From a paper:
Gag is the structural precursor protein in HIV-1. It is a polyprotein synthesized from the unspliced viral mRNA, and is cleaved by the viral protease (PR) during the maturation stage of the replicative cycle into 6 proteins and peptides: matrix (MA), capsid (CA), spacer peptide 1 (SP1), nucleocapsid (NC), spacer peptide 2 (SP2) and p61. SP1, together with the last eight residues of CA, have been hypothesized to form a six-helix bundle responsible for the higher-order multimerization of Gag necessary for HIV particle assembly.
We used two different Gag assemblies for structure analysis by cryoET: GagΔMAT8I protein assemblies expressed in E. coli and GagT8I VLPs produced in HEK293T cells. Upon iterative refinement, the final density maps of the Gag hexamer from GagΔMAT8I assemblies in the absence and presence of IP6 and GagT8I VLPs were obtained at 4.2 Å, 4.2 Å and 4.5 Å resolution, respectively. The GagT8I VLP subtomogram average shows a density that extends beyond the N-terminus of CA, where 5 residues in the junction region between MA and CA are resolved and modelled (bottom). Intriguingly, we observed a strong density above the six-helix bundle. This density is coordinated by two lysine rings formed by residues K158 and K227 (K290 and K359 in Gag amino acid numbering) near the bottom of the CACTD and above the bundle. A close inspection revealed that the profile and position of the internal density are different in the GagΔMAT8I and GagT8I VLPs maps (red arrows). The refined atomic model shows that the T8I mutation in SP1 stabilizes the Gag hexamer by enhancing the hydrophobicity in one face of the amphipathic CA-SP1 helix.
Residue numbers in the entry:
A (entry chain L), B (entry chain G), C (entry chain F), D (entry chain H): 143 to 377
The structure:
Amino acid sequence: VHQAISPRTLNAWVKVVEEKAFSPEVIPMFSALSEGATPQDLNTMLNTVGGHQAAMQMLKETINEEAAEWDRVHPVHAGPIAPGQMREPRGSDIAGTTSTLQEQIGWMTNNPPIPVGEIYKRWIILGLNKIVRMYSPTSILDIRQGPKEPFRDYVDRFYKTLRAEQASQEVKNWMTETLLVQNANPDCKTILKALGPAATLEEMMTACQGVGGPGHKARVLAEAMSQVINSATIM
Amino acid sequence: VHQAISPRTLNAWVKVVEEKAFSPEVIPMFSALSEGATPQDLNTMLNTVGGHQAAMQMLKETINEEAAEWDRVHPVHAGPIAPGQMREPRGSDIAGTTSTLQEQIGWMTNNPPIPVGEIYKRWIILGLNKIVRMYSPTSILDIRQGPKEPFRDYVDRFYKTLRAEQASQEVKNWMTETLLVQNANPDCKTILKALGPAATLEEMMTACQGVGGPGHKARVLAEAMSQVINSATIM
Amino acid sequence: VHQAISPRTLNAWVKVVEEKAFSPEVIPMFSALSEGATPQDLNTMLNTVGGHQAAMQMLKETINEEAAEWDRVHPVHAGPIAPGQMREPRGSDIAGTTSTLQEQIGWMTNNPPIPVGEIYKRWIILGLNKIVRMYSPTSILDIRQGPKEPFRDYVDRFYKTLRAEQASQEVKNWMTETLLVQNANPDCKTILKALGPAATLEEMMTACQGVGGPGHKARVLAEAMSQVINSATIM
Amino acid sequence: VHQAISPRTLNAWVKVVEEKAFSPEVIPMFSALSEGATPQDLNTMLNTVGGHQAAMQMLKETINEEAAEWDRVHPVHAGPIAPGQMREPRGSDIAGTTSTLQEQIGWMTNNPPIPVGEIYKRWIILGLNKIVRMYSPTSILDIRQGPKEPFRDYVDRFYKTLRAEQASQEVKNWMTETLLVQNANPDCKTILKALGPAATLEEMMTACQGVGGPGHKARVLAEAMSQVINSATIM
């Protein structure tokens, strides 16, 4: 006993990860909470992050790569001593893939003092740093209509990423009412907004379903043509 | 071993509690995740909720009250048998105040099968139901200016509750830009909005700092007076 | 056995208490259902009432006061007889605070016939009578706007007490549609009702948010001023 | 010996706390300076912060609450071994309330290695994080006059918080000369500023002592009335 991370600490960690979508100050809080911990608990803190799976790709990858390098530097020669402190850890197992919590303690407490946990900490910090450089948070605020994009697909992507937005209900609702219409292209906006704000996604879709199409194109063009053409001429 | 709640389950539970600010469907998910658990783990699931401390008042209170009633129904007579299955649980301890995890198991596994955990579950469900009836979620959307309220205090309350809003950074920023100005009273709005949208909280505060005051009152009134007075008369 | 109140009787009792919010005829039905019962069951019938906690203050208080008076009249001298019918009941315990169901029967059946249950009945009846005099039922129908009261607070109190109203869903809905608007002050009513009935609590709030404020005041006054001023004069 | 924090480290810590009124980057510097320390020294670092006592409320509170939870998880069973490593620490004493520096070392150095100091560190970090979310620094810059507020009280609050401002003398003086007058309401500003900048707080107070009062109100209103009334009429 007297080794085990408390659930409120893990909850604070997941709180910091959601509340900040990859800001550089994560490392302080991480090293602070994950203090003197054991590697197994460290994997616990890692896969418990929810969403943002994109970066987990790079994180997990830099982890295995450092593991490989520790392998390349460290030899497996050992023996033939009778079983005791069976071996040296291995880059495969310092991350806790092929080892038990038992072996991790039997490494930490036993002498020499091999701080495998600290080493795992070091690698993961390296990784998080590299992540902080190589990421870009996506928001609901960024989703914008392409210039030539069927409006229906636009809403479908809008909602697709909105469901992942981390907020309460009524927030999302009012978002759906203001930003979705606000962020469209001028072509479909000048028709979605002529139709008053009152009418639901169904009426909106049926209104702008024509954009990009030949009929609507011909009309818009013709209109612009005669808009300036008849300004200073007759017959 | 083979008794202990997994951290991802607790994380899902805190997720459901944040994601929904007291909707009636909490009970299903709660009873589902908290299945056959032990009471100690149940207190773990309870105090780990973050924020929304208002309801914890009523929840904790109905808990102790049911405990009292179980006391009033159940007698403490026992003995003088030698120590074994020392007693019956007590409404004080079924909730795990004066008992250890050890006694909870020594009650659950030992025969007769006293399902203390289930009873604690029953009480807490009762409580959550009563909560669902007696609560009202607060939002950022609701914060509105009183009719006679110094604008500065209005912003101070706005921010005060906003910091508790559960969203990412840029969300909050753009909220601060649209809703804060949008939700003011007509009197200070017709001055905050005459000053163009560009200018920061400092300029806004210095602009509406006069509302409610004698100078501004006299002016507004006078203006309204002569607005209609000079409409159909002269000299 | 052959002592225990049946659950449908208790259900009928809670039915009579909800269905009538403190009418004087409660005593008949109470004495009828609670016939020859035991005190423990009587406390069961008491704290099971739901809501209307206001009166429970006075009820519980008159109970402890009669208990005190029974103490003041009855002496605790007894002994040194060997244990049997250990003592006399006590005003602390006739109400069943420090006694078990066992002692209550060992008092009722044993001779002399001490009708402790009846005495508890007598006190509680006294109490309910005093309550019938000192209460006033609150309804949804009574909630009315103060003369100078921010409309938003008015709705907040409206809903606050409505959630406690004892009716089904659609009842409450249609109530919310008719009474809430119907019961406002003339000042905010003459603006809430100019805006057609169709528009939701949001539009209503934003409409009357100005009442009581300096702008709206100046306007209303000015208007009334010139309404009569220009009736019989010019220039 | 070879355990004791050096005074310049503590001085740097108080420097970082004053110099930054609750920015999120406190945690790095705190964990850095408070490295491997002992809990007693940690309480030393805590109560030595000066001013900003508001947050100490929340900090101290979250500390005792984590202590309670460690209690709820950890049992007090121990014995009957003869005195040696007398017990396990307790959530009451890990924070060093009922323990001596001696017991803290006899816990740290003795085996098993119980890192009580680290655990205290973990809790306090959790706390500081929660503080960073739940605080708002007050400045001298924020103090502003309410819209209807006796000017004299305005200056009294101004000075009241200014004496706590953390700067040298002449800074405060020139502040008192510029900001105090600059931040008043339009009504009293248009009189304080008509009286030239030269005259001291006494003359200023006697000048604006009339604001909000009936005389001054009547005058201001009348003035505004005839300001527009006589603009386009005569007789």
